[PDB]
Ligand binder design. Structure first.
Ligand SMILES: CN1CCN(CCCNC(=O)c2c(-c3ccccc3)c(-c3ccc(Cl)cc3)cn2CC[C@H](O)CO)CC1
Length: 142
């Protein structure tokens, strides 16, 4: 029952990041805007780490899930917090841009699904217990 809303948040963020990197293909608005702003701030703060990610990934359709699962499990190893959720969205965004750059566009819809499933199954309980997305908007939005 949460599947569609979590999918909408993931697709809004990924569409935004792909557009920001030059690819125009293929309140809920307050949450989407706060996440876009948080993702931008995160990328500007950790630009070096994105460069290290884009140079060590060697993304292929066969390894993309293994890479996704490895990084996401490491990110949340010590538990969840809002900063790690922002890193999770940012990582997904970076993986999608890298997939399109390497002519592996087929991975974009796959990564969106892996992100929505992880948000649904592992992050949603923490999100609700820590004030919901309205709390996130207060801490990261405007
Ligand atoms: C020696 N270590 C000292 C401390 N650091 C590791 C622990 C903190 N970093 C992470 O957990 C982390 C982040 C991340 C998380 C938040 C901020 C910055 C980086 C990302 C990440 C990469 C790309 C994008 Cl786009 C987004 C996130 C991946 N990881 C885990 C994979 C990494 O190889 C470590 O195991 C650096 C090396």
């Amino acid at each position: 029952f949460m599947s569609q809303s979590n999918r909408e948040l993931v697709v809004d963020f990924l569409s935004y990041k792909l557009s920001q990197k030059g690819y125009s293909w293929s309140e809920s608005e307050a949450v989407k805007q706060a996440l876009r702003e948080a993702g931008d701030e995160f990328e500007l703060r950790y630009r070096r780490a994105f460069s290290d990610l884009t140079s060590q990934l060697h993304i292929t359709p066969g390894t993309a899930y293994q890479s996704f699962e490895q990084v996401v499990n490491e990110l949340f190893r010590d538990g969840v917090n809002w900063g790690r959720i922002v890193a999770f969205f940012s990582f997904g965004g970076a993986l999608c841009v890298e997939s399109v750059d390497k002519e592996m566009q087929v991975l974009v819809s796959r990564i969106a699904a892996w992100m929505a499933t992880y948000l649904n199954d592992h992050l949603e309980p923490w999100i609700q217990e820590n004030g919901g997305w309205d709390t996130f908007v207060e801490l990261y939005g405007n």
